[PDB]
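Q: What does the assembled structure look like for these inputs?
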Amino acid sequence: GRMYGPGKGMSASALPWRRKPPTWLKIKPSDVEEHIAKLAKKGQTPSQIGVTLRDSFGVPQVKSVTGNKILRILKLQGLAPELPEDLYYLIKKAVSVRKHLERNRKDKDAKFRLILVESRIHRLARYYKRTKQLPATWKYQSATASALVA
Amino acid sequence: AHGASRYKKARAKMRWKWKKKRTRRLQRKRRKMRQRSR
Amino acid sequence: EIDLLHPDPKVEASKHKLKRLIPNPNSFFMDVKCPGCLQITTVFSHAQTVVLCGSCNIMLCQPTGGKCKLTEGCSFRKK
Amino acid sequence: VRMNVLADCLKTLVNAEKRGRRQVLIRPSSKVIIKFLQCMQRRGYIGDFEIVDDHRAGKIVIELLGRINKCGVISPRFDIQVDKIEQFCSNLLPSRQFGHLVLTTAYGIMDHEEARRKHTGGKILGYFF
Amino acid sequence: GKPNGIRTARKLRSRRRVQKWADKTYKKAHLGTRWKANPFGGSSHAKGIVVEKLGIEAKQPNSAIRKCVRVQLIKNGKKITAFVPRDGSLNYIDENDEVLVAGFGRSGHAVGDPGVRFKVVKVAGASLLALFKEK
RNA sequence: AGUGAUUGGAUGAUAGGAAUCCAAACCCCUUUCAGAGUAACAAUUGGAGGGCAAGUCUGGUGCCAGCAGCCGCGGUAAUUCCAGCUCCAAUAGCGUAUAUUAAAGUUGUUGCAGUUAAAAAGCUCGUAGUUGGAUUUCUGCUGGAAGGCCAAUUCUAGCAUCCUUCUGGACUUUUACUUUGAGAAAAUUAGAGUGUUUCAAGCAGGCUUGUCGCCUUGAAUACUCAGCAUGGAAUAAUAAGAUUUCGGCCCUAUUUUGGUUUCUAGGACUGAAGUAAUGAUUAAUAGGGACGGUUGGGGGCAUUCGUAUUUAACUGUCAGAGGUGAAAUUCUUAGAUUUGUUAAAGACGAACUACUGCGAAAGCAUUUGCCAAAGAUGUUUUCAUUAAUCAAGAACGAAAGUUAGGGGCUCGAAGACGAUCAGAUACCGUCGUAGUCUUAACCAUAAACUAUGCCGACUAGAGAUAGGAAAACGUCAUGACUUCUCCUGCACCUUAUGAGAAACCAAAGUCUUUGGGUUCUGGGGGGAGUAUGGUCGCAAGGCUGAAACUUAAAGGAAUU
RNA sequence: UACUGUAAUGGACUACCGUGGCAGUGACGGGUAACGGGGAAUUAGGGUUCGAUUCCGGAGAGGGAGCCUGAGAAACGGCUAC
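A:
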């Protein structure tokens, strides 16, 4: 039932049975890895690469074509982000709400939602420190959060 | 105590809303009288 | 009176994606032919972005809820 | 969310037993369930079952007969000490004659009848009768 | 419901010792107020002197005058009213006469027809049954 | 086969010896002279309405005396009192009082209950705590030792590419778990053997004209979390995520007193060529995040509109208007109430408005714009267990109320009169201050209700409905409608060999055929949400929260 | 860290030096009509209550304190003091 809301939604991508598809496809393992390193250099997140691939170009999935996932390829090349994308987009959301909330102080609903996103940042950071995807002793501060994004 | 039943009024009774108020007036009085003897 | 091992093609087509016996996607890919160019482009059925041509950008399809609309008379062949 | 995989499937089984279905599917399937269903199948409480190999946990579809009155699960998985297998089934099972406790042991998953003669206790898993 | 899991000894053990006190009979045992309360000292019987001869009336429906005695326990000099069992025997008591007091058999509380929890077992050590019988 | 004092003849209680016992008496065990016929050597203790086994008996008493653990007997005919007679229960014992155990599934791990009976925090966040998806040498054939029974069941070696340093232990991440074993005083407890005359006991005895007596005499055995040890393939925690031959480098002990210095022998340190498939499980009808077109009376800040109500203005006309069950207070020729056109003011958003939507709950209905935010749906995107539930602790929390400024139309706790009435500080009527509205703080409770905690699985259909999505040579002109399927919402109807005390219930089902995970609460009714202490509050009061004494019923759902 | 003291180990004690140690898994404090255990009562299993008292430890000899002799006592049917 999600997490924070009461909503209980079943919507998801359901991946196919066969692997290394498709028979119709060709190109190469090598040429796809060049395209990913090109678009990462353009400045584009691991989610946004695989959207750009399956939409315009071929490849349904990169894990089908190459052995590796997209973030595995970026981290091998050394064109990976500093912090992971889900933690990035939660912090950027929290900074956006703090601009709104210190303009409009009487908005109680915005004050409620800022607790929920910043609570999620703290617990999701505690994951990423355990897996060593973040430097040790890395912590969220609402003073220094805005410069940390961009 | 009483909790939820508090006002069940299953059988002829004083009425809870009134009862709570009556006890409040007794209690309020207890305060000033106890502070008077300080 | 029932057959969970061998379900019917008609009924399992109606069901949701994940509730089928083997889950697999009801989306697909398309070799699209825009009117001007002789070139062809491999385009996903549900496209979230406005897809441009192989040279001098026309426009293949605009994104919607589910399946993207294809721009005027232009043919498409499923893979 | 979904702590015990075996605990869901035996409730799914025993419901659709009592309704009186010929066969049922269960989900998400495991290595423990196929071994638990295997030691039902020896004693003759269910028929065949397939296990579809979807690229996921997988679905187990069992043919069954009108034979199980009930099967259940003992969470928490208590420890028991060969002395105390007799004390459990006096409490738990409907009679001394028929029924089975079933309990994981370092010589594989097995019934309490097999656990007596091999002479090793373990952790209790569930039961059926 | 309960916590079933193997490491839930504290929650199970703590809940009993807290909610044991919700019993009425558990509190009468295990509180410290048992020793201050009662005129008896957690004891079966107790001697005392009959300060006065008294009469009390049973609550309706029953009506009558029950003939009890007010006594002071020797150990604590605490006054109590003790009922005198059987017909008469009031004559037997004599003010200032030592009388054994025994529980009415209801663990305090009250008996039948008001507010009396004790019975006089013996008078001058003679005992009530011997005299009523006359044996 | 039982009765019938009708007679009738056949062992110790007792008293004294004998020997035995005893350190000296004494008791027991033996044997002795006396020793029962209402077997006067005389069995009592509690009961006889119910629970509870056993009298609609007969006198006395008359809500008196008294019984009565509880329900109840007694007011002049008592199946309960006080007696007599008869019968019942236990019996050399039986009744009473206090504490305690079972009964108590009325403390519930096994094993209770929480819609209405006692009891789900008003609602979300959340740290410990508790609990956590699937997945990593499985199958087959040939032996070997045992093995119960008229080949099953154990254990074990091989062979499908399976270590080695040696001649049993070193390595296999680490424990828990289970198995066997060690060590752990007896007495007590269970228990083997044995006629203490039986028995509770005790640890003794038993054979036998044999004499260095014998049974190479018995007095077994079990039992005694944490700790030490060990076989093991599951389950569950937990850990992690190089090799093969060559040299520089460099320290350190045996044998042929100390200094000397090589040698070889072996360490830990860093290059050069070679080998091995050179080294990352899936992507949960778990979760987070991205992207797409939408949806909403969700939130904040502006802005704008609509009649009405009250006041004021003029403009008519002229005696009533108001209000009630019926009247009065009140307003009125110094022109009310009604007619019309304006203007100001501050509220409130009718009808459309629904067994509809949105929101964590409280709650949220005029137009337009701006600012962030959310769900569902779609997805051959992405990360890969990041999760569930939550002692402390934290945010929001109608109405009323408080504090300090604005605003004050209407309504209106108090107060005021006028009625009604026996009275009426009320219902009804006419005025009317706080309040109602708003900015800035507080307060923290409501029948804050679905009186039903929150995640998850599975149970049963039909027709509606809100949102999104796909299909149709569909009908009319990107959209409205028709037909059909999918999830996600608020519900509704029907029915159950499902449940319940019943009312009723797709959850209150899958619970004596009792265990998916977890938080909080309750233990007869009062006393009492009181007292005292604590802590929060500017106060009002909130949260926490007893006892003495009191009482046999309170309470639930249906029936007449 | 280094003495001292003891039958020996130790903040046991003394000099200097550092700022630690325990606690929500309940520290610290209060109550016990509390000596602990081997055990006792209680007729499914799980439990609940008791254990001054036959044995094994512990402590005490009206209350506290001090000490001699000796292998051993802070002894009390030994001594000194309040």
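The first strand of chain C starts at residue 29 and ends at 33.
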